[PDB]
Design a protein around this ligand. Structure first.
Ligand SMILES: O=C(NNS(=O)(=O)c1ccccc1C(F)(F)F)c1cc2cc(Cl)ccc2o1
Ligand SMILES: O=C(NNS(=O)(=O)c1ccccc1C(F)(F)F)c1cc2cc(Cl)ccc2o1
Ligand SMILES: *Cc1c(COP(=O)(O)O)cnc(C)c1O
Ligand SMILES: *Cc1c(COP(=O)(O)O)cnc(C)c1O
Lengths: 366, 359
């Protein structure tokens, strides 16, 4: 009956015991959780139930829940930042609501009002706002999660669902003053996503398949997987991050390149922001364009590569120093070239996030 | 540290209040559950905990559990059958243990002893014996499920996992129409399509809804530039036809990475090989192969195979705005019904085969 839950209807149950906050200089990503969570029930029969902010607790799930059997699930990732002026800000959160809604449609999970969800998240962050780290390098990670809770074993659109939101303090990925570059494991035997698949959505199924390649990656002394696609060996994504290459292209032009949104690339918020920034600066060519391993190695051979970095919410920007490919270690001169652009981008994005630069990209906490 | 759980140290906690069994005449597939369940806990620090048979209950899961975020999960599907002689039988259950083990490796979930799990399952079915329907048209569906319960949001190999088993009384030609849209691809080479990992299935619900929107019951999964016909929903695809050489042939797509190696598929192949009445070919089949054969009146039957239906005749394919009729039902379907009869006879103990194990 009810098309969406409403922030107006929020039922809040404060915790009676409050946990001590962690040292912001000693945070490991996604391991410590705050006092409270958002939960909202849905059923086909009654529609959306009233949303609850309540103490962080285990989920009680029928063991037949479709999220556990057929990966009927999706997530988001966005952050709250305590500013230089001690104001807490969200960064481009409407883009995450847009993406989550679209992933829900693709998953066949129930549709919701994006502004109502945004306001419920605002209220949850406001309640746990002291968990937003008092550090200009740490932030509060927000994990909205949407699962099918259909008890029956038929492979079908769920008639029961749970939307929930977790909060987790996260620290810097740089340390001792500098970036921590990654080595990438490039094995064309694995594919992250395919044309006709769901790689342009944040559905859980895209990620469970990537764990094997990641373990093999770690066994070979690499931190992330470089995801290759097709007979041409297109470079697509770095782990769970978008791929950027800053180089002199085939025409001899200084260029920032990233793979196009042709269905196998997750449309990152960070990725969009970087494209926007680089276009605005107007200092070099910006291309959404295919990039192969042969393109890369040829350019490296002729000293045309400047930097390679990955982009995502957790780290904003992550420089790439090495790629393990066909039994060889190929060096990327990212760190030797500054990294000039990667550092410039990180500074710009963090300025905005922490309120050093006024931009419409941020929103002050409700 | 503990490499496997063992059926030896099974802890059995029977329910004090038992539920009434459903009418075996009106069962809805996976909607009704028995009194008990198996659960086995794992962690990287201590290895496999002791297994438990206990009352069916909700799972208490950390909201960060990787099964909920990154689909760190797999399942199996197999059945128990109350024979004509009242003996309860499992059917090729070691093949399900083999496949579950493969799926866990690909998923990075902890490995276990296959013989130990089968025995834990046998003890579970044994406890809940009376739930195996008193009907030769019904069976007990067995659902082993294996999930990551790692509380942290980092995308990595789980340090926490839960293995559980559910039991569900299920009942019972009604041919299906297939919706064929090449813009959805079920599986890719370098993917996980040959495992029963949950991630393979979440991505399929949109296509199935679209299928229903158009009066079709299942999706025909197409692959590649040549539009290879691969699987029928959650079933393997069989084509009974006269091939291009003018030979009568049973054909099915080969196991090149994008096809789930079905148990039913295996059994049908074994049987058709044994009979030696027609050619048996694991080979590529395209939409053009099929439409060309249909024009020349060379197609006899098309059916899917899986544990839930055993065999499912196909009457129509909707592809590129066309309605392509398959003469399955106008040809008996004799092969489909022969297979259904054969497997049913073995499953319900009407004939002996090493494929069945008495509980
Ligand atoms: O930003 C990163 N990931 N992108 S993300 O933030 O949007 C994301 C996407 C999908 C799943 C999980 C994640 C997250 F949160 F990183 F865990 C990321 C991964 C990563 C791995 C290393 Cl080793 C270093 C820096 C890193 O940053
Ligand atoms: O046997 C079937 N599916 N194969 S299955 O049995 O191994 C299976 C595989 C993956 C997920 C779920 C299932 C199951 F159990 F059907 F739900 C099946 C699907 C199906 C759909 C229709 Cl419309 C009619 C008969 C049918 O039988
Ligand atoms: C989330 C994600 C991205 C990065 O997206 P952001 O919105 O910038 O955090 C890129 N690739 C994959 C596979 C992702 O899951
Ligand atoms: C399980 C399944 C099959 C059928 O396999 P059986 O072992 O015969 O039940 C076929 N295709 C897919 C995608 C499946 O998951």
């Amino acid at each position: 009956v009810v098309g969406t839950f409403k922030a107006k209807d929020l039922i809040v149950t404060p915790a009676t015991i409050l946990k001590e906050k962690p040292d912001p200089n000693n945070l490991v990503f996604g391991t410590v959780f705050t006092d409270h969570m958002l939960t909202v029930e849905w059923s086909s029969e009654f529609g959306w139930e009233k949303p609850h902010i309540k103490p962080l607790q285990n989920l009680s799930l029928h063991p037949g829940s479709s999220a556990l059997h057929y990966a009927v699930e999706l997530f988001e990732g966005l952050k709250a930042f305590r500013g230089v002026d001690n104001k807490i800000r969200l960064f481009q959160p409407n883009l995450n609501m847009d993406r989550m809604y679209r992933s829900a449609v693709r998953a066949t999970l129930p549709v919701f009002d994006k502004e109502e969800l945004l306001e419920c998240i605002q209220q949850l962050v406001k309640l746990d706002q002291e968990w937003v780290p008092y550090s200009t390098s740490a932030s509060l990670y927000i994990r909205p999660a949407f699962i099918g809770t259909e008890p029956s074993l038929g492979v079908k659109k769920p008639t029961k669902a749970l939307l929930f939101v977790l909060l987790s303090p996260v620290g810097p990925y740089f340390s001792s003053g500098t970036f921590n570059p990654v080595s990438l494991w490039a094995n064309p035997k694995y594919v992250r996503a395919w044309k006709g698949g769901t790689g342009d959505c944040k559905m859980g199924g895209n990620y469970g398949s990537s764990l094997f390649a990641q373990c093999e990656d770690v066994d070979n002394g690499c931190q992330q997987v470089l995801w290759l696609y097709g007979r041409d060996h297109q470079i697509t994504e770095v782990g769970t991050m978008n791929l950027f290459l800053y180089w002199i292209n085939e025409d001899g032009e200084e260029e920032l390149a990233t793979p196009p949104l042709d269905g196998i690339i997750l449309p990152g918020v960070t990725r969009r922001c970087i494209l926007d920034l680089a276009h605005q600066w107007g200092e070099f060519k910006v291309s959404e364009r295919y990039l192969t391993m042969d393109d890369l190695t040829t350019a490296l051979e002729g000293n045309r590569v400047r930097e390679m970095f990955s982009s995502g919410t957790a780290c904003v920007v992550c420089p790439v120093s090495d790629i393990l490919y066909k039994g060889e270690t190929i060096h990327i001169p990212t760190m030797e070239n500054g990294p000039k652009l990667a550092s410039r981008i990180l500074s710009k994005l963090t300025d905005i996030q922490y309120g050093r630069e006024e931009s419409d990209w941020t929103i002050v906490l409700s």
